[PDB]
């Protein structure tokens, strides 16, 4: 959570784990 959120977003977001400028809540939260 909050950093394991980062790990999970590395999982989910595929190969584009860019960060900080639910499933989908992280989806338009990570994609370049």
């Amino acid at each position: 959570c909050g950093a394991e959120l980062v790990d999970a977003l590395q999982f989910v977001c595929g190969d584009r784990g860019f960060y900080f400028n639910d499933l989908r809540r992280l989806e338009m939260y990570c994609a370049p």
Binding site: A8, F11, V12, D22, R24, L26, E27
Partner: protein
């Protein structure tokens, strides 16, 4: 297992688990059944555990006022009802007021035949018409006159639904990513959200209502998901989904998604559910090996036994073991032991309907028209090629792919051989005129661990026997042992060796004389 067990008067009511206990083991009931389960905990599981083995029933079966029942699956083995007694109107199967019955029997697989009596389902507010129609299919035209109040059976239930298809399934050792195609009712504002259910299911015999009670004890895990951000065309919108977390590796899971909508008299819609999907998480590192035990069946062979990690995280294969030597941590080659001293959902539905109502009213108003070993499938291993007394260390470690576990340690030491301590030959001695006698004995080149001291015993002719300690340092320094100040007379001397493990054999007696002055 009783097969012809009877009951008093041919009828019996069941209220709690205690009443149903009378039929435990009775494969065939020679008496009519009435069920009136209303409350409790783990009622479905208990009820199955007590009556699940029933196969045939003599008499007629009734279900009344069964608030607590959600499925009739606890008649797991029920196959036949003869229906001799029937009922008023000659009925064999009978159900009323089951304010929570949902399933009846899982009719995709189960089979049930009744010889005498028709079917009777009224005032079942949550029983879909598919289940009763399936009842009619295989209940045997020749027995039913249908006697179904089509307005009362499952009037609160969704009789018709669509099927959500998953469009993307991706797995980890502990989490699962699910995406499914979007479903939009004709009025998209009716979709309050999605409902996702999941449970660990090592077997594919899982239904939607197994192990469920009206009071609770649900076997599924409930997760609520908000509706997607609706956008024009599939080119812009994204599939709704969820990120399952907190799971266990190498574990099969049963997942299915259900749609939550607001009931409306106009433009009636019910939603969709997804078929049960079985997803297995990936395999990870296999915990840690359990309980190593070591004993040696020979001075050079040691036998090790252990146990597979409690959490295998995958079928376990290719066990890995190392051995290493553990020499003495010094301080023993210098110790002199001869010295002294040393040795409510309705509110949500209403409130959504209120938002929709105000929006519609506003729109209507405003818009106006115009070394190592590899162990396989054994929990034991015997080692070899170790010294007679040297201790060794073994770290065994469980593995999975050839991805393997952490580690585990265990120590051992082999039993000695007394021959390694034994001395050979007599004591070669020299005599000097100053009453000094020097004694030699064979040094064990390879003792059991280490020789700590030598026991030299000599006795004068006709007198007692004296003893002396010769440490390893003393043996290295004096090159043997010199007896000085001995009384005049004849003596016989024998020498024994002492090691870490024990003592060797005594040397042959040696005679010497001490001059008298």
């Amino acid at each position: 297992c009783p097969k012809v067990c009877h009951l008093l008067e041919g009828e019996k009511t069941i209220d709690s688990v205690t009443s149903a206990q009378e039929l435990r083991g009775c494969t065939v009931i020679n008496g009519s059944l009435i069920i009136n389960i209303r409350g409790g905990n783990n009622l479905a599981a208990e009820l199955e555990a007590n009556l699940g083995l029933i196969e045939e029933i003599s008499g007629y079966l009734k279900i009344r006022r069964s608030y607590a029942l959600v499925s009739l699956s606890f008649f797991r083995k029920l196959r036949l009802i003869r229906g001799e007694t029937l009922e008023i109107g000659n009925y064999s199967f009978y159900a009323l007021d089951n304010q929570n019955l949902r399933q009846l029997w899982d009719w995709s697989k189960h089979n049930l035949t009744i010889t005498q009596g028709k079917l009777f389902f009224h005032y079942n507010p949550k029983l879909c018409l598919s289940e009763i129609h399936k009842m009619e299919e295989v209940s045997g035209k020749g027995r039913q006159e249908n006697d179904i109040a089509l307005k009362t059976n499952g009037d609160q239930a969704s009789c018709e639904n669509e099927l959500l298809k998953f469009s993307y399934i991706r797995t980890s050792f502990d989490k699962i990513l699910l995406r499914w195609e979007p479903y939009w009712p004709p009025d998209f504002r009716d979709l309050l959200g999605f409902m996702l259910f999941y449970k660990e299911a090592p077997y594919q015999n899982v239904t939607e209502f197994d192990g469920q009670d009206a009071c609770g004890s649900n076997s599924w895990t409930v997760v609520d998901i908000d509706p997607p951000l609706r956008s024009n065309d599939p080119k812009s919108q994204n599939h709704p989904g969820w990120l399952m977390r907190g799971l266990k590796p190498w574990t099969q899971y049963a997942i299915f998604v259900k749609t939550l909508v607001t009931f409306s008299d106009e433009r009636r819609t019910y939603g969709a559910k997804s078929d049960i999907i079985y997803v297995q998480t990936d395999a990870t590192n296999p915990s840690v090996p359990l309980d190593p035990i070591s004993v040696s069946n020979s001075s050079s062979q040691i036998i090790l036994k252990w146990k597979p990690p409690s959490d295998p995280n995958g079928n376990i294969t290719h066990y890995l073991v190392f051995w290493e030597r553990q020499a003495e941590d010094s301080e023993l080659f210098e110790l002199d032991y001869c010295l002294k001293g040393l040795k409510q959902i309705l509110k949500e539905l209403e409130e959504s309907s209120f938002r929709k109502t105000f929006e519609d009213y506003l729109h209507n108003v405003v818009f106006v028209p115009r070394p190592f070993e590899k162990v396989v499938n054994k929990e034991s291993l015997v080692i070899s090629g170790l010294r007679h007394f040297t201790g060794y260390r073994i770290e065994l470690q469980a593995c999975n792919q050839d991805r393997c576990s952490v580690a585990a340690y265990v120590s051992a030491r082999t039993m000695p051989e007394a021959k390694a301590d034994d001395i050979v030959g007599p004591v070669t001695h020299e005599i000097f005129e100053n009453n000094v006698v020097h004694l030699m004995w064979q040094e064990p080149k390879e003792p059991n661990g280490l020789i700590v001291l030598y026991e030299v015993s000599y006795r004068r002719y006709g007198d007692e026997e004296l003893h002396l300690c010769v440490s390893r340092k003393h043996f290295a320094l004096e090159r043997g042992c010199r007896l000085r100040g001995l009384s005049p007379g004849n003596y016989s001397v024998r020498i024994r060796a002492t090691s870490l493990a024990g003592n060797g054999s005594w040397t042959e007696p040696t005679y010497f004389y001490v001059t008298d002055y």
